[PDB]
Design a protein around this ligand. Sequence first.
Ligand code: GTP
Lengths: 104, 120, 133, 179
Amino acid sequence: WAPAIGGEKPSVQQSAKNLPGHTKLKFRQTGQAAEEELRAKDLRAELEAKERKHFGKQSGTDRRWDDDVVFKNQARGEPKQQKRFVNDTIRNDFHRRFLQRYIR
Amino acid sequence: GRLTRLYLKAEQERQHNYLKDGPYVTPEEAVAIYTTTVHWLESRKYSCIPFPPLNYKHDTKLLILALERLKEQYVVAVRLNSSQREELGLVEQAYDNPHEALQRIKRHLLTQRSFKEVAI
Amino acid sequence: VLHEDKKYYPSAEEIYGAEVETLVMEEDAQPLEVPIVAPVKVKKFETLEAEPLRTHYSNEFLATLMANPELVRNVAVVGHLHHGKTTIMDMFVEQTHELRKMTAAQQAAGKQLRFTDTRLDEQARAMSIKMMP
Amino acid sequence: IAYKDMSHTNSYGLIRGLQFASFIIQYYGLILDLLLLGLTRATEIAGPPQCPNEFLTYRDVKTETRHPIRLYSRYLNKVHIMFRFSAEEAKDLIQRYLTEHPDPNNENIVGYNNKKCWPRDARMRLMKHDVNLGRAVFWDMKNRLPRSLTTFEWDNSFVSVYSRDNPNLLFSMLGFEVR
RNA sequence: AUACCUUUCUCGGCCUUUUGGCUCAGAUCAUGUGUAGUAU
RNA sequence: CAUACUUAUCCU
Ligand SMILES: Nc1nc2c(ncn2[C@@H]2O[C@H](COP(=O)(O)OP(=O)(O)OP(=O)(O)O)[C@@H](O)[C@H]2O)c(=O)[nH]1
């Protein structure tokens, strides 16, 4: 109904997680998207380049033994399964496979 | 517990879809199947299994086999619940009077077409 | 009959259209070991020094002594394994250059110098691996 | 069927905790056995009603050899079949299979199930005639079953061919891997 | 003694709330004598 | 007077 609000000698209890560690910061160097390096370039050129590369270079274009047998061709007509995402908790494919695997 | 719930949602839905999407077995798959079975059973000179006769020579041996089987779950049993105690009571009754157990069983097979809830 | 391979929903292609690209990304392209921001590493191949060192001669003195064939001798130094070649070259370096505090660092760290054994992997086997002029 | 606050009516399956569930399973499976075999290979495997022949045996060798399906068993919902094929029979089968699942690239062998549990020489090889006889008899027996009742799944199946270039016949039956 | 306004009484009526949040409905659910004290 | 309840009291 209402959370605790968290407003702010000093106590001398020292936590283990509060001991010195990672005591200097990494900064972005030349080569890791540093700010002075990135004013120099046209990021729209590189984005439209990479998007065009992706979007084109994904498109790829510039009587027998079985005579008494009562049923014939019963696999033909079966649906081949597809890489798809269903946003359903219980009706997606991971879940149907999971329940198939673990419940016998 | 979570997986029995998840399985039972899936299984409730499978049972629903059967009643909506109808018998999956096609009317002329079922008939080819029924007919294959008929021609098999007739090739085998098979005779149906009849309803357990009244003066059936084996009726009480089969019931005693049944009851032995049902009792066997209770030969290590250390603490029983009301359905396990009720089961042991009815096993004892059917050992004590096999003839009225047999008559109840045959009345069940003859008449009973609606049954209680199964726990899963 | 439509089985319990029933479809409950349309595809992302019926949902979004032909001109929306629909991606299902269920596994990562790369492992956790490939940084997302690649560290800008000193590419530790064979690490030399950052300026021509002090010698007992100049630059132009060697420039002189090169331009006339009668004061230049070309010599390769060979021997068995370990028989002293690298160390003799090193003694030459030690007598004709300026590297004394280098020697102090060498006998403080507990190793004797190997000048021509420069590649720090040829170094850590006490072996000359590739000839050096 | 009730679990706690969950409940539904069973209309479709079989309740396996019934005491006579095994009898329904075994009779229904017998019907699926007759679907797999036909009423002639079944009546030859079974033997006459008067003189039935024992588990894996036949009355004659003319009766035994008439048909590819040589040995047959079903352990409740699990089937083991041994066929022996002529190379003419095997060839006709592999033909019909590929003409039904045409793949020019030779992507046939990729998703094949043969167990890594045995040593690498002794397992079933990657010959095209052998991988394809495997998949072709799987496919041809899987076509025998109305998919409204059951299918076979390749991932819960196992075929092993003993051919020229394969010396061992493999199966696993109950917990036993047999080579 | 009647018409007006106006004032009084009697019927008809009303919202949050008191909701201990979660999980494996959290789990299980039921196999005594004997005395005495009491309720009956 | 007969059903029930019980209590680190008492046995089986
Ligand atoms: N006793 C003695 N040992 C020496 C002398 N000179 C060098 N050494 C030792 O011999 C070892 C091998 O000599 P290196 O300097 O590696 O010479 P190398 O024969 O070229 O060896 P590689 O690099 O393997 O070809 C050195 O690490 C020294 O410890 C010397 O005059 N006397």
